[PDB]
Paper text:
Alcohol dehydrogenases (ADHs), also known as ketoreductases (KREDs), are of great industrial interest primarily due to their ability to perform an asymmetric reduction of aldehydes and ketones. Switching the cofactor preference of NADP-dependent enzymes to NAD is of particular interest due to the lower cost and higher stability of NAD, and the higher efficiency of cell-free NAD recycling systems, for which low-cost co-substrates are available. We crystallized CBADHS and TBADHS1 in order to elucidate the structural basis for the observed reversal of cofactor preference. In both cases, the size of the cofactor-binding pocket is reduced due to the substitution of residues 198 and 199 by others with bulkier side chains, which sterically prevents the binding of the 2′ phosphate of NADP.
We performed full combinatorial saturation mutagenesis of all four target residues of CBADH (G198, S199, R200, and Y218) replacing each codon with NNN to yield a library (CBADHLib) of 16.8 million unique genetic variants encoding 160,000 unique protein variants. Growth was observed in three of the variant pools so these were each subcultured under the same conditions once, then plasmid DNA was extracted and sequenced, revealing the presence of the same CBADH variant in each case (CBADHS) with G198D, S199Y, and Y218P substitutions. Unlike the parent enzyme CBADHWT, purified CBADHS was unable to oxidize isopropanol using oxidized NADP (NADP+) as the cofactor, but could do so with NAD+ (Km = 17.49 mM, kcat = 333 min−1 and kcat/Km = 316.67 M−1 s−1). The resulting maps showed clear density for NAD+ in the case of CBADHS, but only partial occupancy for TBADHS1. In the case of CBADHS, this effect is further enhanced by the presence of an aspartate residue at position 198, which would also prevent NADP binding through electrostatic repulsion between the side-chain carboxylate group and the 2′ phosphate of NADP. Interestingly, NAD-dependent mouse class II alcohol dehydrogenase (ADH2), which is distantly related to CBADH, contains D227 and P247 which are equivalent positions to 198 and 218 in CBADH. CBADHS was not among the 567 variants proposed by CSR-SALAD. However, only NAD-dependent CBADHS could support acetone-dependent anaerobic growth of ALPS cells, which lack either intact transhydrogenase gene.
Author numbering:
A (entry chain A), D (entry chain B): 1 to 352
B (entry chain D): 1 to 354
C (entry chain C): 1 to 355
The structure:
């Protein structure tokens, strides 16, 4: 089979590979629609997770089951499925402690395009189908369902980690796709004021749609001063770090109130340092909690978010600004995430 | 001053009373708009909180400050305020443990028409004005703002106590005003499926507006079987008890999954004991947590809910089906809560103004 | 093989049964030491969980692995293991939500002598060996190690559900073996005052050892009034329900403060009603949270409690008052739990495999 | 009255001062025993909290009430009291949100020797006596009781923020007085393995007393390698940062497991920034939560910790290595915290 792969660091290309075979508890899936993620750009062109050889990329897909192992009981060939980007090994001690994302190692619940061939191929492999797949509703648009696999679960996890209260003020730094879902998720945890911080105009209309009450552009002043001006010097209750470089941590600490929470869902791949400013952190005693986590996956998470979409708790269509048709456009779409034209949020490639 | 009072158990009426005077840290407030609560029907006609003599009723009001004590620093006469129904004494050991609602005693954070003259008078008294009042925005409709003081904070507390997750399935038993904010709150905590249980048609359209995805009527079959049929025998993640008798706890325990949470905000005014169905509670070992709490009050809560309204997170106007103009209609409005016509959710009395 | 079984309701006896075989992920264990639980007396003589026929009893054992399935990777024949009484199925949606105890159904994590042949036999079956077993330290006395599997994990779960704070006052109702570990667990969560409620003298000394600061006897006065007298009318922050009848729930609600937490680990097997007293529950608005749960099992829990014993955080030997030697004494030991002589807390039967 | 004060940065001295007068809700207290804190050395000689002029130092005291305001109801002159180092303003919006320590500002619940004349004087002022004092039990040694006001509440808060579970493995970095109470607190939250990190033998012996199962000395190797060797490369569940430089945060992140919690109770007085190591933090996605908080105060905290001492849950006497008798020795004791002989844990000055 053909697949679009990281040959090595700074090298992309189509490769031929043997089709994966399903173990007793696994499924082989054919993609129906996929989306590129900025995490693959960090991975390929920055070596943020180390070096790889012939690793098929991509981890956002909805697909059709083509083969199942003899012990798979809830899915069969022909079933259409939402595939969460995180597919844990459920029999691990980390699962017993409540951390499916790190089953058998740090980030090891995220396999696709981390250390396992991803979804940019004619077929891909899902471990433990009954625990890690969910049925795609018959009338749900493919582009919407692909947004569940990563953008929605990651952005909402930012809001869950932030422990938002009814009426909390929230700053979301970085209003790309993940930050837009952080804004939506904060609204769905009861946030009052939500300030988005970014410089891209396409995201402003989407950010307001999902629930932003204020938009700040760093280009017209240092952002902490801008936030202090908006909040009369009081700061905000919660900060979600969804995009930008490592210096946003220092910004988040400086704008959150004592007792507040900072929630990172941004993947920090770069040579910039994550620095906590000492004085604004109350010399370590200001109860400014800092969290950061890989998104949950598995069947339960996927089915619960699927129900949110089905009952219209969030309209995911606003994330998808570009739609391509055909394997041939996977390369162009991924390179789009590297260059980022001003009007791109997420791109979806539809396979026929 | 004039006030509408509980004369005793089973007796309502207008009374004349001396005006309250503010202590050094208190405010005297004038109502601008008020609403009757079903809890006052429990208090007066069931003696659910004991006996009272000439207690002015009501605890849902927005008003104008007319007088403040010498140590009040953030409010002055003329300020228009949202008055939370719960107004705690903030200097207590219960406050140090995080339970403002019970500062200096069980439920003692709720004073108005519990053991303190309430808001159905020409003036009423608010303890610790700086800690217990919030400014009413100039452009907020009065009838919407009165819904903050009790319905919203109670309904949202129900959803807060339920510890809802992104996509949790939720049943709300009782879709009166409080349950409607339970539905709204559950949606604003990320609930997926929301099943409302009630028999009153007026609440059906409001429930759908606030986020209900299914509506069950108990009159056409035992409600647990109905929920089991909707959920393929699996039950739901969370139950909020917002209305009905003591038997709703048994229904909630029976329809919630093992590991789930039951969140009671219903004020149970009759019966000696609430019954836990033993087998459906896993004989005590099914991890079906049971909670129940008085709504939070105080300035911080009121300002945070106010911000939710100001930023259009919830539209409170759908709660208000009846609006009167004039102080004197407090009597008719409260009596409406006793008789409950088919089309009532909440009534607001707006006092005459220019 | 021989196994000590519930022949029917009200009938105990030895039966011959096929020796279990392990599936690919399972282990077969030979018991080295076992303990009878009061719940098995309830099952046989009260039919509290329904009717069973020829179910081998017992769910407290440490043992030796004799056979493992072809996919077992961390345990091998010859390993000595602690077997938690709760051995969940780990591949379920309830596990993904964090409730191992109810994987694939309410209380379905408790298999032994619930709906699965238990440990009172020559061999028994453990599902998912890699997820549900823990290595027994070579120098840990067997009778101590058996107390981990049920008594320690249940009592400590009572203290965990109670969400104790540094200095909380705690009442533990029923200071049998489980309540004794409830006392120990409460101390190990930072409790200040710990009031034990019981009438059995043997438990009083153990209760003081494990951390009780006061002991109240229900027989000489209404306990709620007694607790109010001890606390100058203020009540307590937390209640752990570990023994007694269904009426202890109402008593717990009446003695806990507003905002407090009641934690049930007592299995209410009788048809007596569980009642929340309305006025003392603030008519539903007093923030008196009621929790209740089956004890966690699995490898991680067993290893974490094992480390606590190894590092001397709790001395389990005070639970064991009776030690037998020989498979034959299982009947006598189990019947001891039915009658409960004045000097019994827990009994352990030590097995001596031979030809 | 006389008091030992921070004249400015790098200037200590005795000053003459007016005796404070109690407002309607306050108490004036005469100290019976006091203790110097390392935090005062940060404040004076590092200017960690800004500049001060003639601020009386000290915030660990037990005393006798000599005067109360007209509205004080539970305390009267002659009462002997434990005075928590944190004495919040209880009527603030931060109290309504559950953060007494930051009432009316970051760290502002801690007044003594922060921005209020402290306890190293003949008298000092306690705001809101009914809310901020606790009765000293008749039979409690004074030197033990002084350890409640700061060392016990701070160390235990470290264990509380750490969210310890029954059997959690815990590393405590820095085994001075606060770290010793972190060890004691971790044990009283049910920790199994407790690893103490320090190089001072007296603190090692005390750490074993309070519950440490292993002791690591930084002098025989990088402590992360040592912890990884002790845990066969698995790491620990929880880390409490109780002493050391800013780099201890990086060390904590490297030794804690994915999903673990790092709890800072160390007052960081120097440096611009604390660095979070990127890869060891899972590039932001390892669910390694970082907390850090000023100790709780107020009457309820002091009474609950007092009950723990009365019921022998913790023996505080092992904290006290140096005892002076006489007001005159306040200067010598505080300078001891600056020099720190190898066998010092805490010093107490007993006043007559
Ligand atoms: N597979 C996974 O586990 C996973 C999934 C989703 C996201 N992530 C990570 O989360 C992050 C979010 O993804 P995305 O698609 O939103 O990224 P993105 O490329 O859209 O960047 C986010 C936004 O932040 C803005 N930004 C850049 N610098 C900024 C600054 N200094 N201040 C404020 N805003 C700034 C950019 O304009 C951009 O719109 C990514 O870095 C990604 O690697 C990982
Ligand atoms: N102390 C306070 O401040 C406070 C605040 C809010 C609410 N409360 C209490 O909360 C409760 C809710 O108040 P409300 O204004 O919604 O009352 P309500 O009169 O609207 O009653 C709620 C609804 O529940 C329905 N119901 C009755 N029996 C039922 C059953 N067996 N199953 C299902 N549904 C049933 C009724 O049809 C009604 O429409 C009240 O009992 C009130 O006392 C107290
Ligand atoms: N299935 C399981 O895994 C499991 C595990 C542990 C415990 N449990 C359940 O937990 C309970 C604890 O068992 P145990 O071994 O401690 O039983 P036990 O026989 O030791 O009984 C506990 C104590 O409660 C006392 N008591 C009786 N009535 C009382 C009252 N009114 N007030 C206060 N105390 C009273 C009894 O005298 C006894 O002292 C059992 O009922 C059991 O069913 C179940
Ligand atoms: N708000 C308050 O008043 C308050 C309360 C409690 C604690 N604190 C702060 O908490 C800290 C506690 O100080 P203490 O007196 O308990 O301890 P301490 O002053 O003895 O210092 C901790 C010890 O750890 C050791 N150490 C140094 N570097 C290390 C490293 N890299 N790894 C391991 N160990 C190392 C040193 O021997 C040092 O003495 C202080 O810095 C203090 O400022 C402040
Ligand atoms: Mg970015
Ligand atoms: Mg479109
Ligand atoms: Zn991604
Ligand atoms: Zn009301
Ligand atoms: Zn048992
Ligand atoms: Zn200090």
């Amino acid at each position: 089979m053909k697949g679009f792969a990281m040959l090595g660091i700074n090298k992309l290309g189509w490769i031929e590979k043997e089709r994966p075979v399903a173990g007793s508890y696994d499924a082989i899936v054919r993609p129906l629609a996929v989306s590129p993620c900025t995490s693959d750009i960090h991975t390929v062109f920055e070596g943020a997770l180390g070096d790889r050889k012939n690793m098929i990329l991509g981890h956002e897909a909805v697909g059709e089951v083509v083969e199942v192992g003899s012990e798979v009981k809830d899915f069969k060939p022909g079933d259409r499925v939402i595939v969460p980007c995180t597919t844990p090994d459920w029999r691990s001690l980390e699962v017993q402690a409540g951390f499916q994302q790190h089953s058998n190692g740090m980030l090891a619940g995220w396999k696709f395009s981390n250390f396992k061939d991803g979804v940019f191929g004619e077929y891909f492999h899902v471990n433990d189908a009954d625990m890690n797949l969910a049925i795609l509703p018959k009338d749900m648009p493919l582009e919407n369902a692909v947004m569940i696999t990563d953008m929605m679960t990651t952005g909402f996890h930012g809001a869950e980690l932030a422990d938002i209260q009814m009426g909390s003020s929230v700053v979301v730094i970085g209003i790309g796709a993940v930050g837009l879902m952080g804004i939506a998720g904060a609204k769905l945890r009861g946030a009052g004021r939500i300030i988005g911080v970014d410089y891209r105009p396409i995201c402003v209309e989407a950010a307001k749609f999902y629930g932003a009450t204020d938009i700040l552009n760093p280009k017209n002043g240092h952002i902490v001063d801008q936030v202090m001006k908006l909040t009369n010097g009081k700061g905000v209750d919660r900060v979600i770090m969804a995009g930008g470089g490592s210096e946003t941590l220092s910004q988040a600490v400086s704008m959150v109130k004592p007792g507040g929470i900072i929630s990172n869902i941004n993947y920090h791949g770069s040579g910039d340092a994550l620095l906590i400013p000492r004085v604004e952190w109350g010399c370590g005693m200001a109860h400014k909690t800092i969290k950061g986590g890989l998104c949950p996956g598995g069947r339960l998470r996927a089915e619960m978010l699927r129900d949110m979409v089905v009952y219209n708790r969030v309209d995911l269509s606003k994330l998808v600004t570009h739609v391509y048709h055909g394997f041939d456009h996977i390369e162009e779409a991924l390179l789009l995430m590297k260059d980022k034209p001003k009007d791109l949020i997420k791109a979806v490639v539809i396979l026929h």
